Amino acid sequence: HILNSSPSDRQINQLAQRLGPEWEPMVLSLGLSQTDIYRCKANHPHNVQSQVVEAFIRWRQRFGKQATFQSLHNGLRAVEVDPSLLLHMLE
Amino acid sequence: HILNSSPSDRQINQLAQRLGPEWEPMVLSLGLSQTDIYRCKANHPHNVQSQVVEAFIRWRQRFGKQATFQSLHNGLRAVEVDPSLLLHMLE
Amino acid sequence: HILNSSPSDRQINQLAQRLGPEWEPMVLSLGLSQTDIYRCKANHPHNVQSQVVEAFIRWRQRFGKQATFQSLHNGLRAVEVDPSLLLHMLE
Amino acid sequence: HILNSSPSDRQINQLAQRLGPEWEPMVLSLGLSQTDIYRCKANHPHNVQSQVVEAFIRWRQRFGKQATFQSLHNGLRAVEVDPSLLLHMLE
Amino acid sequence: HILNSSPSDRQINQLAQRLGPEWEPMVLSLGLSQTDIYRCKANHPHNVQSQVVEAFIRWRQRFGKQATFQSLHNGLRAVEVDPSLLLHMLE
Amino acid sequence: HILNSSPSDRQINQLAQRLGPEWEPMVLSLGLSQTDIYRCKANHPHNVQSQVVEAFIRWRQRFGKQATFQSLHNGLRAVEVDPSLLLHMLE
Amino acid sequence: HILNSSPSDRQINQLAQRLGPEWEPMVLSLGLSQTDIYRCKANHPHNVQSQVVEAFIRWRQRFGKQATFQSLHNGLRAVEVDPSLLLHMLE
Amino acid sequence: MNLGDAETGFLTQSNLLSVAGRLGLDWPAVALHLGVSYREVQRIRHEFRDDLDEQIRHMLFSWAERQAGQPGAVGLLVQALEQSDRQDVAEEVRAVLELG
Amino acid sequence: MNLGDAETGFLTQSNLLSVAGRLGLDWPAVALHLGVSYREVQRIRHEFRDDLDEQIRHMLFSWAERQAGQPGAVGLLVQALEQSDRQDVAEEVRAVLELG
Amino acid sequence: MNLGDAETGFLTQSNLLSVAGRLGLDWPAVALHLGVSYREVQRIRHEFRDDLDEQIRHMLFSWAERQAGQPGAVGLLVQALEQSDRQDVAEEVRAVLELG
Amino acid sequence: MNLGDAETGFLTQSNLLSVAGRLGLDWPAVALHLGVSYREVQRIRHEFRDDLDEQIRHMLFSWAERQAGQPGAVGLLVQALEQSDRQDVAEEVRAVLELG
Amino acid sequence: MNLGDAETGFLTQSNLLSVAGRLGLDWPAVALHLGVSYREVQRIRHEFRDDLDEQIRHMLFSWAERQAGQPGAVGLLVQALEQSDRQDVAEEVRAVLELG
């Protein structure tokens, strides 16, 4: 229904806030490479939040129309985390 | 009485000094989550002090007026530490 | 041409999720010394996930064409890890 | 005597050189907040020398007169570090 | 023949993309100095991509004709990387 | 003849590459302080390789003329390491 | 008479090397408690070398008096380490 | 500058200036939640790369200018600060604001 | 705007302008793939050090200026954005552009 | 300038310059705190972008003028510098304000 | 381009130009022991925020002007470089300085 | 223009432009190694602060003029490009020469 639309800037920010270490593994099962992540940590040495958010803007950009919640969901699971975040963060 | 006000950054830092590995359990029973812990650890990979100080900061920042010296007190028992630390870090 | 091609950054992100403290003996059985061990371990102190994932990126960059999916099976057998965990991540 | 004056642009630069991991806990007990520090860190990503100076320039520009070597002496002590450091960069 | 040739603005740009945190070591063994690399991180503080890009321009300039795809190839191995990047980026 | 000259950056690079976790002691034994290290770790949080490279540059720059291959050798030994390194990188 | 004179940055790094896995139980009689050793294992998770090296650094910022080279006899052998290592490291 | 109405209360420059002061490297959050594009957060990080204080400042005061007319202004900020995990700061604003 | 061709379609000032608005610090990546001299990127980055937008816009429109005549520059642009990892915008460009 | 009444104390351009030159990039703090509009801090900055020192002066004097007559307009300068975390220059202005 | 007497030795531009190329992100450290104010180190870091090089050249050469005559202008520089934990470049400078 | 004699080497307005354009933000170095003082680099930069091309071209021809007949002029440009890590350019010249 909405699992086909891409997350917004603000939305990526909220998602990011709720991810711990699993973000790295996550973005991998999503389409980025060690390089992309390294370039994220690169651009925001101090402060992780900013790293993660970029990683995601990174993702959503490389996959345009395809970088969607559906994809996000599948990734969240691939990294063993409840896809509840999505639904709840959507209220 | 002073118990009903949040500690300053100097105060926090002094506490961050007299705390050992139990700080994590403590900040947990205080309201933070295993996530906030990791980010604190990830924001200061080298330098433990900074981790603890940021956790507690995050703690104060999340609960605002409710992050009181009373909580710190409780937080200490929570993790079985003698509450007089708060005293000898207020003199 | 399945056991002659190297895996991607998504796959290694899996062969690292489901593994125990015995991955190190397994990553040395491919061409990594104690210089690459005290490194993948150093560039990621907290979040052992990316520690394991880099051990392999350190593995596929030093071998390239000869770093086949057969090589990641050469160690599995030599560490008690059933050689069938490479097909459950591709089914 | 000099005990009640204020370190200069050059003297600070000196002090900075010799301080390490505790430069953060030091400037906290001097009057800076955790937010000041993030500004230093951020305003000088690569390079800690530059960070620690801004840290001290702030502290002197905030407490003007009251930013004496006396203050620094206590601080150093406070942050568990030989107070003689001030003696060595004053010759 | 194309080996004893110098990469173009376009090609340096492309190659830079592929490179991870091992660019520093690659440019070091290619002729640039620790003093040069800093000039790169400084000029583009939070954009590793353009850092790596200036670095190879610096290089191609410092050594002129001496800076050939060939010598570029050696740099890749010397830092533990698959020199096939050069071909998968030249199609 | 050559043992009384300081190592270039292209060298210190290869030296650091082949050093594991023992580098920490080796440099404290070469003249730097624990402090100098934190600064190196501080300046390159994500990427140990660099921490070392910088750690050595500080050394060379601090001592200049005296930071000679000869001095490194003793360092290598003093930290129970096979001096074959110098004789190796020098090929 | 060097029995009443503390060590240094190159001395403390020589005693830290030889000391076996008893660098935790040895400091449990010299003057370091539990918020001290677990404050070193933390700052440096990996490299069990610099953890021991940051412990004796606490032997000159908190002690200094009954902690020089004479309190190194009742401490080393207070954990199965004959105090003759004091003479063979002072050569 | 000219934030809020008579009923809710107003926000002086000194106030907004105080918020910018309590913000750190989490500025981008408050900005995203305030509905600023990510593309823009980045753009600001550039125009003032050497000065954090100014980026935190420019972000605020520019959003301030934008919402110069709007009513729910001071409301949106407080909410954004809440969601950025700074109840901390949300309460100071609600407080100063206490007067209408 | 004279960027395109009668069969495929043309882009309007505002269309490119959108592309410019959606690019950020990555712009150089695009510009170089678009085949711009690193010296030109270098220059522009200097002539407008303070204004990020102006860099992106000048780069983009100068490039359009040069490709004016040409056969398929909208293709080069779509490809360059795709190789700069901005499928993101490449698609946004195909959408409008693709009319003919 | 004529900044200062016989009561409080005066302030010569020489005293004003003593200030402008002791101020860094935190100028906009001092500015905004003196009630200086942010579009003015914005305008001033740009209208002299290449010369930092001309900014700190144009801002400080343009404002020193608007305070033609006015009471403790000198106290305003001092209080601003004070909430701009610069007791630094605040006390130097108190010291110079030691004429009688 | 005019430092030192014949007793001590001189320092061409090619000379100081290199002393500059030999300095990195520690330039501020040097110019501080040289006598430059943090206020001015900052004024410079800002005027060339997108060019580390010109930041350093401008730093040194602008200090070379203000040194036009004086006694051991060159002696001081060597002193700073040492004082800035760079026995490294302290020695080369003394080297090339051999002629008097 | 008319740089170099009928032997040493020839460099026409053409060639001089070829170089001018091939330089960029590092020109102050080439100029500094060529002899020009930091005061003139400064002046040329302020007489065209925004237009880079002109700064370069004006600086190179200003010097071209001065080295009128002078023999070792061409070789001096070359020795200057080399000292500014632009072997890059230094070879463009070495080749343009071996045609006369």
Curated annotation (Swiss-Prot), chains A, B, C, D, E, F, G:
It is found in: Cytoplasm; Nucleus. Residues 8-80 form the Death domain. Changing E80K: No effect on interaction with PIDD1. Constitutively expressed in most tissues, with particularly high expression in adult heart, testis, liver, skeletal muscle, fetal liver and kidney. Changing N13D: Loss of interaction with PIDD1. Changing R39E: Loss of interaction with PIDD1. Loss of PIDDosome assembly. Loss of CASP2 activation. The Death domain mediates the interaction with PIDD1 and the formation of a complex composed of 5 PIDD1 and 7 CRADD proteins which in turn probably recruit 7 CASP2 to form the PIDDosome. The Death domain mediates a direct interaction with the Death domain of RIPK1. The CARD domain mediates a direct interaction with CASP2. Forms a complex named the PIDDosome with PIDD1 and CASP2. Interacts (via Death domain) with RIPK1 (via Death domain); the interaction is direct. Interacts with TRADD. Interacts with TNFRSF1A. Adapter protein that associates with PIDD1 and the caspase CASP2 to form the PIDDosome, a complex that activates CASP2 and triggers apoptosis. Also recruits CASP2 to the TNFR-1 signaling complex through its interaction with RIPK1 and TRADD and may play a role in the tumor necrosis factor-mediated signaling pathway. It is linked to Intellectual developmental disorder, autosomal recessive 34, with variant lissencephaly: A disorder characterized by mild to moderate intellectual disability, megalencephaly or enlarged head circumference, and a mild variant of lissencephaly with anterior-predominant pachygyria with shallow and unusually wide sulci and mildly thickened cortex. Some patients may have seizures. This is Death domain-containing protein CRADD. The chain holds residues 109 to 199 of 199 of the full protein.
From Swiss-Prot, chains H, I, J, K, L:
Changing R49A: Partial loss of complex assembly with CRADD. Changing E54K: No effect on complex assembly with CRADD. Residues 12-97 form the Death domain. It comes from the Eukaryota. The chain holds residues 778 to 876 of 910 of the full protein. This is PIDD-CC. Changing R86A: Loss of complex assembly with CRADD. Loss of PIDDosome assembly. Loss of CASP2 activation. Coiled coil: none annotated. Changing Y38A: Loss of complex assembly with CRADD. Loss of PIDDosome assembly. Loss of CASP2 activation. Changing R39A: Partial loss of complex assembly with CRADD. The lineage of its organism: Eukaryota, Metazoa, Chordata, Craniata, Vertebrata.
